[PDB]
Structures are given as C-alpha cells and as structure tokens.
C-alpha cells in the first residue's frame, strides 16, 4: 500500500536515493498500482533534477497509462512551465489524447496556464482538437473564467464560434457559468450573440436562466435578440419568470420585452410565475402589462396554475389585481375545483 521507492524519491526530488535505486534496479519506468511512472510524479511536483535523472536513465517521456495521462498532460495541467519545456525538449508528443480525448493544450487551457498554452501552440499543438463531448481548448478556457487564455487562443486563430456536441459555443459556456468578462472578450472579438443550442437556447436564454445579470446586459448591449424563442417558444422572460430571477425580469421589462408572449403550450410569462410561485415576479409582470385572466392550453388562467400548486400569496395577488375565479377550463374546472382536488 506504499508507493515504489523510485516514486517516493521522485516526490522528494531525492536524486541520491534515485541514483542508488537506479544503480540497483535499472528500470526507471517502474509502475505503481495506479499505473503511473516516477516521471509522472516528478512532472506533478515539478522535481526537475529527478526528472532529468530519470530521463537520462531511459524513462519513457511519452509513457501512456491506461487512462492516457502522459507526463506532458500532468505538467500542462499543473502549470509546470519548466517541466513542460524539459519534456518537450526530450521528445514529448504534443497531440497525445487521454481517455476522454484531452490534449495537453486542453489541460493547460482548462486551468488557464497562458505561458504553457503558448509554448504548446508554438510547438504545434492542435488548437481545434476536441474532447469526447466536442470541447475545444477555448471551451475549457471559457468554462474556467481564464480571460487571458481565451484572449491568447483567440490570438492564435481559435474558432470563436466552435460548437460542442450539444451545439454550445464558448459564448454559451460563458453565459452558463456567468463569466461576463469572457463573454465581453468573445463578443468584442466577433462571437455571434444569437447562436442556437440543441434546444434553440441563445446565450441570452442561458443568462436569463441562471440569474447572470451582467452577462445579460453585455449580450443585450452587443445586439442579442430580446424576443428570441426556442424550439418550444420560450422567450428570455419565460425563462426568467419561471426561474424567479426578479433582477432579470425587471431588466427585461425595463428594456421593452413583451410580458404577453406565448409558447407552444400557449403559456405566458405570468403563467410560469404562477406555476413556480414567484409572487414578486408575477407582481412585476402585472404592474407592467400582463393579462391576469389570460388563457392557455385547456383554457387555463394563471389562477388555475397558482391554485394547483397551492400557493395562496400568488392566488391572493392574482385575485386582488384582476383575476376572476369563475373562469373555467375546457373540462369545466374553476380554480376552486383544482384547489379542492389537491
């Protein structure tokens, strides 16, 4: 359950113990239980002396365990610039992929190591290489809020609108994670603000979903469509009203988003605020424009949706403003019949 002695000497950078061990056992590529050579441990802790000692005794600079993590991968992930240089000088392969198809550039960009990424690019690393999910290094840089890494990769002609398997652009990832600085750099460099995901989600839709207000303002300022709909017809106010993010719902209504838009299910933003139960969104949706007695599929008012879930503050806001209890669905169910049912 203890590491092999050459792995322990690698972690401690003990070149004297390593020299004695290699004199006794001439194999520098001894495997641990995980399958990692001592060169992998030296690359992780940037022990350059024991790394050169191991490489001078025949250690495989391109050793590939079962998971595909070469020492160059570890050095790039850990930010070991000097170890990356040493491994590249001794013949490390620049395009080798892990089990999940990550290149060393993927590991560098995911952790935002600008210097290492530039060294790998200058050595010919593929900037458009993809993982199993279709993530390019710029996707990993945008996911980690690594502004200078998005900035360097864009300088090296990375595709600003590359898509994953879920049709996610780096702008989509930035909107998802709330990184408004990455989104600002991408949009100021020509990224399309109305890119569609697999379900037709724009970056504005995702920003309105996750209550990322700064990304929302940046997108709307860089010409994102405020009335863009999904495959299901969801506007950004449908997403904001359903998720309950009052900052987004007020910002979208101050800018002139129609609070009376519909979806495949003829649902309006006040219907989704009644079904979820956000009485401060609904309150704003009415204060502005929104039809308290508006109807959807089956002839359902927001009073019906609020009475189904049993929210009384919502019922009491809808009923106080203009809601009429006597309105009934196609099956004849008033809000008093749903409330009696539940």
């Amino acid at each position: 359950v203890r590491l092999p002695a050459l792995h322990i000497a690698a972690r401690n950078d003990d070149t004297r113990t390593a020299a004695v061990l290699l004199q006794n056992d001439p194999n520098p590529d001894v495997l641990s239980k995980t399958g990692f050579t001592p060169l992998h441990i030296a690359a992780h802790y940037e022990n350059l002396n024991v790394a050169q000692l191991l490489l001078n005794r025949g250690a495989s600079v391109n050793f590939t365990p079962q998971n595909g993590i070469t020492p160059l991968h570890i050095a790039s992930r850990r930010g070991n610039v000097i170890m990356v240089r040493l491994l590249l000088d001794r013949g490390a392969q620049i395009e080798t992929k892990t089990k999940d198809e990550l290149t060393p550039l993927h590991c560098a960009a995911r952790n935002g190591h600008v210097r290492i990424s530039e060294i790998l690019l200058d050595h010919g690393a593929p900037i458009q290489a993809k993982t199993k999910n279709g993530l390019s290094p710029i996707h990993m840089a945008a996911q980690g809020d690594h502004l200078d890494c998005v900035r360097l990769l864009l300088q090296y002609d990375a595709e600003i609108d590359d898509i994953t398997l879920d049709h996610l652009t780096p702008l989509h990832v930035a909107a998802h994670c709330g990184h408004h600085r990455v989104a600002k750099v991408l949009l100021d460099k020509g990224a399309k603000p109305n890119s569609r995901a697999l379900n037709g989600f724009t970056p504005l839709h995702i920003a309105c979903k996750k209550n990322h207000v700064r990304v929302m303002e940046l997108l709307l300022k860089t010409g994102a469509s405020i009335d863009a709909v999904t495959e299901s017809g969801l506007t950004p106010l449908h997403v904001a009203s359903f998720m309950g993010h009052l900052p987004i719902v007020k910002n979208l209504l101050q800018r002139g988003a129609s609070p009376n838009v519909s979806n495949v299910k003829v649902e309006t933003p006040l219907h989704m605020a009644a079904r979820a139960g956000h009485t401060e969104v609904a309150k704003y949706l009415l204060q502005n424009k929104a039809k308290v007695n508006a109807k959807a599929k089956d002839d359902q008012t927001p009073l019906h949706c609020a009475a189904r879930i049993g929210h009384t503050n919502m019922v009491k806001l809808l009923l106080e403003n203009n809601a009429n209890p006597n309105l009934a669905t196609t099956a004849g169910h008033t809000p008093l019949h749903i409330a009696a049912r539940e």
Binding site: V1, I8, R11, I69, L135, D166
Partner: peptide
C-alpha cells in the same frame, strides 16, 4: 503527517485523475 503522500491512495488523490477527464456538458432541462 509528512509521510501520508508516500501511500498509493494519497498519491492517487493527489494526482487528481478526475481533472484529466471531460466531466459533463450540463443542460438542466427546464
């Protein structure tokens, strides 16, 4: 203390094998 990193379990935890994998591409279906 000061000798835990010499064990295979601690080293595997230290090497962070999950950081060399594509975790997921979440969508959060509404």
């Amino acid at each position: 203390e000061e000798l835990q990193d010499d064990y295979e379990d601690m080293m595997e935890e230290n090497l962070e094998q999950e950081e060399y994998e594509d975790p997921d591409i979440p969508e959060s279906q509404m």
